[model samples]
Target chain A: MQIFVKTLTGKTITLEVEPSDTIENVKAKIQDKEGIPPDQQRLIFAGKQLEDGRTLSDYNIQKESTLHLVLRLRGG
Target chain B: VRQVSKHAFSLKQLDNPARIPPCGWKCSKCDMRENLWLNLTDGSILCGRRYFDGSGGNNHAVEHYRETGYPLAVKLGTITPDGADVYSYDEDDMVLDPSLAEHLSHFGIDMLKMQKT
Candidate 1:
């Protein structure tokens, strides 16, 4: 199925993924857009963590859905 | 903290030189799912309709505003130990591109001024 990810500026894009894909793959795609590093990446969906090397198969996410990526940075 | 008085108004209603549009790429509502779009290429987001702070940190008081028309409300903010902070009231929680922010800031018309372009 297709999923749409929304940015802070309100720009939205769609991605196609299967039920077998992991969240890590999604994380990699998000980083590709925002320039966020892997370790610093926090893909939050339903208030849960999409840690490194974890996949949707592990989380039992059978359907395609939108994953919200939160970037935490400390300003000086 | 300072107890300051504030109110909410739409950028479309403002009469200022800034031609700021509502939040999130020509949006004008609170449809997070339909309105909020993402550029997966870099993770930069385009949020739904809302009022955001486009003030240049000089003459403006509110740090940021979400164009969702959430009158008399506020959004996300960050304050560091180094005395620096930013108010980002967006549908997607992340740092926006500086160029995009600057471009969006120009459209922010302070409704309090009763000025139009």
Candidate 2:
């Protein structure tokens, strides 16, 4: 199935994946489209931070759902 | 958010949506399927506008609209449960369709069922 990642810029990117893919796995897919590093990104769904170890299904994420993506942090 | 379009009133989905093979979507006129436009009038899928810089797309979507007079198309990848990136050629801009979910239902497509188009 597919899901969406909304960037900070209000743009949305499409992602194709299995329901079992981990949050880290999802970041990799985001990297594929955006060239952003997985570890440097943060994904938020339903106002909750998505942990790397958790699977999409574990969060009850359904098809066509949108998750917000933002930069983790920048060096001072 | 955009406003509901004029074309939204008289839209119809085909009884048979003419869906394709199992993996992914494809344009009826060409094999390029990535940047596609899904026509709401008759459920036709076509390639989106071709880029001027020769970057991508084949412009089949615009051609379909010009030839058939279909008014609305939603970019495949931009839809979510909340809303979609819908365009109205007749309106000459990106317009919203409040009944998008209902319109797609006529084609046997659920707004929340299919994720990435």
Candidate 3:
């Protein structure tokens, strides 16, 4: 299934991935496109944090569903 | 015989939906029947006789929609490189993005009240 990823800057990217792929796999794909590492990325879908171990289908993320990407914060 | 342009016409105007034409209406600008229509954000009706391709015939309508705010003439969803999907809100199990929720609150869409309904 394909999903739409949006960055904080309003840039949106569409990725082709299997629904069975884990959320971590999605982050890896985002890393390839946006150059942001998986660990440094925070994905939110349907008002909840996307679990790394969970597949996209686990969250019922269908085609054209939006996934917001935010950079992980580093607090001193 | 409403004329929006040489090759574009609106079937159903948003502001005046009472005058919506029946289905299978032929466009005033072309020979194509059952043309695609869009109600632009500025309350203007845009008709696409040839599916709004970047070529001749109905291209001006596309340009007019872009110049007039480019705001969700047909539908609203994610913005991709090619096009966007038609956005339909699922009121039964709606989940709002945080930013969307924040913006809706600013516009007086009480999230708590909506959730309780």
Candidate 4:
């Protein structure tokens, strides 16, 4: 399966990873690019936390599916 | 020679739902949790952004809602190194920095021209 991505700030940042990749692995890749820690990271799809240890396939994440990865970190 | 820009739209605009169209989208710059002030009177439908004004105060910017095009145009102007415009309002009066008058006059809605006394 393929993953279409975007930045927490809504700028489109797409990445491709295998369906076998755990949420943790994909998260690590995102951290490399955006530097948001995993504990503070949340990936919301249609508006729900993409559960841990879950496969992209389990969420039925498909091609052309756009999921939102948001960082809970905030400041003034 | 006093010059004031257009009188800002009233805050009553919020309760005036008939005047507000359905906003289908959310802001890219701000989270959607807060109620942002809107000026229905403007054409571009520009929205206001809130910024902290040093000592816990906030400045709400409703830029060029019915006027011209400047990204940060709004209720108050900031002083640049070049010294631009400024706006001030209190219960009794509204004041615009004199430097901005010539620039504001280009819009034809001069608030300074409004008689206060």
Give TM-scores for every candidate, taking all chains together and pairing residue i with residue i.
0.33, 0.47, 0.38, 0.36
> What tens-digit string does per-residue lDDT give for candidate 3 at B6-112?
54555554775586543343334455443233333342333442221122235333455445544333222221233322211122111223344343345454434
lDDT of 2 by residue, A11-44 (tens): 9899998889999999999888988778667899
On lDDT, the leading prediction is 2
Top candidate by DockQ = 1
Q: Write the per-residue lDDT of candidate 2 for residues B15-86, one digit (tens) a residue.
A: 888886545688888998687788999888888765323445788887888999999998887777988888
DockQ of each model against the real complex? 0.06, 0.02, 0.03, 0.02
The TM-score of candidate 3 is 0.38
- Backbone clashes under 3 angstroms, per model: 39, 0, 0, 4
- Report, for every candidate in turn, its global Cα lDDT versus the true structure: 0.41, 0.81, 0.54, 0.47
Off by over 4 Å in 2: A1-76, B1-23
* lDDT measured at residue A65 in model 3 versus the true structure, 0 to 100: 90
Error of 3 at A27 (Å): 0.4
* Alpha-carbon runs more than 4 Å astray in model 1: A33-35, A73-76, B1-117
**lDDT score, residue A36, model 2?**
76
Pairs clashing in candidate 4? Answer: B4-B111, B4-B112, B5-B111, B63-B73
